[PDB]
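COMPLEX REQUEST
Ligand: magnesium ion
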Amino acid sequence: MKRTFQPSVLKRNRSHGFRARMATKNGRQVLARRRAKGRARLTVS
Amino acid sequence: KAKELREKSVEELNTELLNLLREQFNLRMQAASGQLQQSHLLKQVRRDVARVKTLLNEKAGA
Amino acid sequence: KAXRAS
Amino acid sequence: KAXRAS
Amino acid sequence: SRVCQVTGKRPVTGNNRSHALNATKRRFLPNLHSHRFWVESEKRFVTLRVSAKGMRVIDKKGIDTVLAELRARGEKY
Amino acid sequence: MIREERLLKVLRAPHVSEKASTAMEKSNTIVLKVAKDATKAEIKAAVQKLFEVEVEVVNTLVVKGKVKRHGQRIGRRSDWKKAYVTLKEGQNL
Amino acid sequence: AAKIRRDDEVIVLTGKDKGKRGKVKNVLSSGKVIVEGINLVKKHQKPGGIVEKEAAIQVSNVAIFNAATGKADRVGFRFEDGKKVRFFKSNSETI
RNA sequence: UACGGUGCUGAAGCAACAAAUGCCCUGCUUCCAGGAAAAGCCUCUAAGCAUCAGGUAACAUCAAAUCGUACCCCAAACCGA
RNA sequence: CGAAGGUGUGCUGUGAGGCAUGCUGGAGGUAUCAGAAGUGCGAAUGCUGACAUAAGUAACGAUAAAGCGGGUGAAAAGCCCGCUCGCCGGAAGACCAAGGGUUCCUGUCCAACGUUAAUCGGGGCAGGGUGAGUCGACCCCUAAGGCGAGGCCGAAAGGCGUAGUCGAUGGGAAACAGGUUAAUAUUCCUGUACUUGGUGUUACUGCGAAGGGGGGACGGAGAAGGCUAUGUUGGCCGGGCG
RNA sequence: AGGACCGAACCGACUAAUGUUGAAAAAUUAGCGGAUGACUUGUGGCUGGGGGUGAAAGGCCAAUCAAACCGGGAGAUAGCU
RNA sequence: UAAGGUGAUAUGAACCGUUAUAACCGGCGAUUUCCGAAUGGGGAAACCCAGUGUGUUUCGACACACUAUCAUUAACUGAAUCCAUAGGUUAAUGAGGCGAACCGGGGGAACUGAAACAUCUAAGUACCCCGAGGAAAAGAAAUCAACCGAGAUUCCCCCAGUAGCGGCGAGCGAACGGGGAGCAGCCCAGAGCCUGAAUCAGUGUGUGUGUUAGUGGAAGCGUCUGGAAAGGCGCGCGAUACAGGGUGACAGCCCCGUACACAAAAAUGCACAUGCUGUGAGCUCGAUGAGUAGGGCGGGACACGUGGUAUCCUGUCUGAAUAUGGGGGGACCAUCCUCCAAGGCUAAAUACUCCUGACUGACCGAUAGUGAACCAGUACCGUGAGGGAAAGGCGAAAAGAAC
Ligand SMILES: [K+]
Ligand SMILES: [K+]
Ligand SMILES: [K+]
Ligand SMILES: [K+]
Ligand SMILES: [K+]
Ligand SMILES: [K+]
Ligand SMILES: [K+]
Ligand SMILES: [K+]
Ligand SMILES: [K+]
Ligand SMILES: [K+]
Ligand SMILES: [K+]
Ligand SMILES: [K+]
Ligand SMILES: [K+]
Ligand SMILES: [K+]
Ligand SMILES: [K+]
Ligand SMILES: [K+]
Ligand SMILES: [K+]
Ligand SMILES: [K+]
Ligand SMILES: [K+]
Ligand SMILES: [Mg+2]
Ligand SMILES: [Mg+2]
Ligand SMILES: [Mg+2]
Ligand SMILES: [Mg+2]
Ligand SMILES: [Mg+2]
Ligand SMILES: [Mg+2]
Ligand SMILES: [Mg+2]
Ligand SMILES: [Mg+2]
Ligand SMILES: [Mg+2]
Ligand SMILES: [Mg+2]
Ligand SMILES: [Mg+2]
Ligand SMILES: [Mg+2]
Ligand SMILES: [Mg+2]
Ligand SMILES: [Mg+2]
Ligand SMILES: [Mg+2]
Ligand SMILES: [Mg+2]
Ligand SMILES: [Mg+2]
Ligand SMILES: [Mg+2]
Ligand SMILES: [Mg+2]
Ligand SMILES: [Mg+2]
Ligand SMILES: [Mg+2]
Ligand SMILES: [Mg+2]
Ligand SMILES: [Mg+2]
Ligand SMILES: [Mg+2]
Ligand SMILES: [Mg+2]
Ligand SMILES: [Mg+2]
Ligand SMILES: [Mg+2]
Ligand SMILES: [Mg+2]
Ligand SMILES: [Mg+2]
Ligand SMILES: [Mg+2]
Ligand SMILES: [Mg+2]
Ligand SMILES: [Mg+2]
Ligand SMILES: [Mg+2]
Ligand SMILES: [Mg+2]
Ligand SMILES: [Mg+2]
Ligand SMILES: [Mg+2]
Ligand SMILES: [Mg+2]
Ligand SMILES: [Mg+2]
Ligand SMILES: [Mg+2]
Ligand SMILES: [Mg+2]
Ligand SMILES: [Mg+2]
Ligand SMILES: [Mg+2]
Ligand SMILES: [Mg+2]
Ligand SMILES: [Mg+2]
Ligand SMILES: [Mg+2]
Ligand SMILES: [Mg+2]
Ligand SMILES: [Mg+2]
Ligand SMILES: [Mg+2]
Ligand SMILES: [Mg+2]
Ligand SMILES: [Mg+2]
Ligand SMILES: [Mg+2]
Ligand SMILES: [Mg+2]
Ligand SMILES: [Mg+2]
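STATUS: Structure written out below.
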């Protein structure tokens, strides 16, 4: 049966990548929150 | 050793750089070949290159 | 580049 | 070549 | 934005109040109109987005005084 | 013309292996570890200057470093560039 | 400055070797010293054998031996000729 | 022959018939529901250049970097703990 | 010359408790009278960890299927080699994209992992291995769509959009056969090619774009002819005489 | 010619049995429907939560849907256990 | 500053150093890839691709610098369109992004409470957004008071759960006045005279005084138990040092410190003294903030829910007097008192702690205390936002068990 996760690196990066996050103020707030939490991996990039 | 290099000119320092880089290349080949017994020479030449390049920048002015 | 869309 | 710094 | 260029009148918020005193949020907009003002000094029409109140200010003060005020704020025409 | 300072940095080590040994004996090809940003033109220039041999052609590949574990702690070795430098016929290093 | 240094004749204040004397062979940044003949351990060395060797002793468990008085002394610091010297506290003599 | 494989030597090497869903075919015929774009490419001149630049062809010569390239891939390596 | 804690034992108070002491433990403990509370647990389908029970029970994942000899080994139903058998064969073969990322090859090891054993492994460990002008990416070009200088709009945040600029799943130059590694190959080697661009020279010369035009450049269905891949048979050549 | 016919691939899911601490949080086996179309499929794109999308079942919107998920208001409130 | 040293797991190797270029510590420099505001263009972050100018070459190439956007100003240029303007290019300067709280502003819930619920509450809270500073904001009376007076703002304690507000329910909740902290006043709306005199800013030289490394720093032995003494016992000694830590059990005197006394080549905070460059003090003469105050309509804010509702703000429509005048004194009027709006600046008392140092705790002691004593915002889970663990202790010494 076809499950929900069908990986595409292009779609991954376009959906959730660093530059997608930087493109909007809300995406930049994600990065701010993840930096403040001290995440080793800020994004899927 | 910076005492000695400080008394050299720019062109004298530039030839010393190329001489150290050539030695650094030769040591790197020996060390890679398992022929360099004296591992400490790699650090010596590396720090000597740094010293010469520091003085070259001091001669040209910050 | 442009009214076609580029 | 060296853009790294040489 | 709905901002008078002369006065700086902008949308303000408040309540609609029903007979039963139900408060629903509303806005009060300025009575804004794009109007071409004759400036005899420059020998030109200047279009300003102006509240009706701002037009009475221009009538009272004169367009040259008002435009000088806009230049000091760095508000463009 | 590449500067000699650059040429003295690009060649890192001779690569020792059965394949490298076979490359030298059969095809007159030395295998070198080279700086990761070394181009074919720089490697050619460096080999001709420093080893004093005529180079025919340089082939290059990037070796991706292996993921390894040191005491159930995960690590990755560095990527490095390998150069197959084919010397002109009769040069003999 | 360090009161106990390499080559000093020390006397052991504390432990199994209390009272014994030896020369300080090395001074470790741990705050411990290897004194020759002192604090001997029998290491079971792999190929290799059972080897008697000096284990490091705490530096505060040895004292500078004042050979004149023939006893453990304490060290102090003086300046003499614009240079810091050690002196024995008891007799006030430069070491 | 170190029984895994190495080194050497090497004949004939044609015809007929059948034959694609592949090729001719971005074709042809026919239909209505009427079937991308832009560049490369070819050509035209403009301002400008005007015994040059530039074009064209011939020859010579140099250059063509960088990154990917292992392996699985209807699956024990991907999506399903 | 043995603290707390742990574990016995004895004594003791109406009770919560208390005292003493053997052993363990190996460095803390704390009277009294006051003072303060994270102050007392069996329940909350409480929370975390540990460990039971069912139970050595069910199950060991397609009913394509094994048998034997030899090898290696501490040990072989399972590994290696051999013979036989069976199963797939528009696939259960082969090559890829996507995705994964060393799983590849070699040596070595068998704790754990592998639903069993394991000498074997996609497992551990170490070393090796990916070679390009022509394959692909990058690159030129655009689609849907995205972003978008100015701009228009919007309490703010922002929204939309012009020039632009991105964006393949589409358009745009060129390499083939043979050989080869344990592991790469249209990449290495051999043989034989091809493409685009830069210089230089020779000859002849209207060159010149952000502009014009052409072209690129396009549907469904159907039909038939001509072909090749490919197959079959003969001929040929080598071997055979059961 | 055809939302034409029979029938593989491909798309689907009518019946039955099995399975129901599964081989599988929807399958397997035997049959079954469509199979040039209102078909099917790859890659990429767009629509966002009282919102989308819906040949309409309150279906679907990441195993979640009469108002997704995550974080926050937050120790909501709980005359109940 | 030094007799040791080349960071950790973590040995080893090869070295370096011992009286001063080993190492280490501090000041100031140098170097400082790529991504990221990311800024030469692009982009699936850590990559791809340029232009331009200089310089260099072995003509294959190489090196270096610059090239974002916006704002402001300047220069030059330049449409329709004649002037002109828009527009264009170039230069200089600034901005941009990040950051825990505190602060000001623009927007702004609901659960909940009211034993239902709509007014009301929750609450101008949560949250979103913008902007700032070391604090912010506020601030020098068109203020109160009550016929006596006070004298800017802010903060604390009272006043007082009072007066009031309130489906007069639930709830909400002042002020006057008093006691304190801290105190500070000014400038423009304009000329003239006299001159640059007052006072803070800026940028230097000194001067002290902090900070960023450091230096010296007292005094104990014997014996007993023990693996070990710091314990017991005996006899001493220092104390402006008996804070604290370490050492083979509990150490004033073994070590590191502690009290105390000293220290800076260099950079820099601060407080002053003194140049330079802006800056203008003082006096006389004035002047005295208009689409404003006020009004009508709609809202909002005031403890105050439209109420008899003063006062403030203004979306909308209007609209004075301007010192012979105007505002306020809780409907309103008269009288009296008091103040002077429609311009602006201003320290301190106040708020906060991402961060640095020291010190403290009837705070925790590994299921506690941070989620995290440990390589934890990790492993792991999730497309993603996001969620999010478990896991400390040999010994005094590895003497970590040769054979
Ligand atoms: K390959
Ligand atoms: K693949
Ligand atoms: K006990
Ligand atoms: K007590
Ligand atoms: K329980
Ligand atoms: K059991
Ligand atoms: K078995
Ligand atoms: K290529
Ligand atoms: K490229
Ligand atoms: K026969
Ligand atoms: K919803
Ligand atoms: K409510
Ligand atoms: K209720
Ligand atoms: K004693
Ligand atoms: K000691
Ligand atoms: K002590
Ligand atoms: K008014
Ligand atoms: K009055
Ligand atoms: K925890
Ligand atoms: Mg080649
Ligand atoms: Mg390559
Ligand atoms: Mg067909
Ligand atoms: Mg391959
Ligand atoms: Mg309790
Ligand atoms: Mg219990
Ligand atoms: Mg109970
Ligand atoms: Mg159980
Ligand atoms: Mg059994
Ligand atoms: Mg049973
Ligand atoms: Mg049974
Ligand atoms: Mg069974
Ligand atoms: Mg099986
Ligand atoms: Mg076994
Ligand atoms: Mg067998
Ligand atoms: Mg079997
Ligand atoms: Mg077999
Ligand atoms: Mg592996
Ligand atoms: Mg394998
Ligand atoms: Mg097993
Ligand atoms: Mg393996
Ligand atoms: Mg847009
Ligand atoms: Mg493009
Ligand atoms: Mg494509
Ligand atoms: Mg292969
Ligand atoms: Mg044929
Ligand atoms: Mg049909
Ligand atoms: Mg269906
Ligand atoms: Mg079926
Ligand atoms: Mg039918
Ligand atoms: Mg059919
Ligand atoms: Mg229904
Ligand atoms: Mg679902
Ligand atoms: Mg709802
Ligand atoms: Mg709440
Ligand atoms: Mg609750
Ligand atoms: Mg950019
Ligand atoms: Mg850039
Ligand atoms: Mg800023
Ligand atoms: Mg209620
Ligand atoms: Mg202020
Ligand atoms: Mg009075
Ligand atoms: Mg000292
Ligand atoms: Mg002392
Ligand atoms: Mg002990
Ligand atoms: Mg006034
Ligand atoms: Mg008033
Ligand atoms: Mg008014
Ligand atoms: Mg009124
Ligand atoms: Mg109101
Ligand atoms: Mg009044
Ligand atoms: Mg914890
Ligand atoms: Mg414990």
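REMARKS: Chain C is about 0% helix and 0% strand. Residues 2, 4-6 of chain C lie near RNA strand H (CB under 10 Å from a C1').
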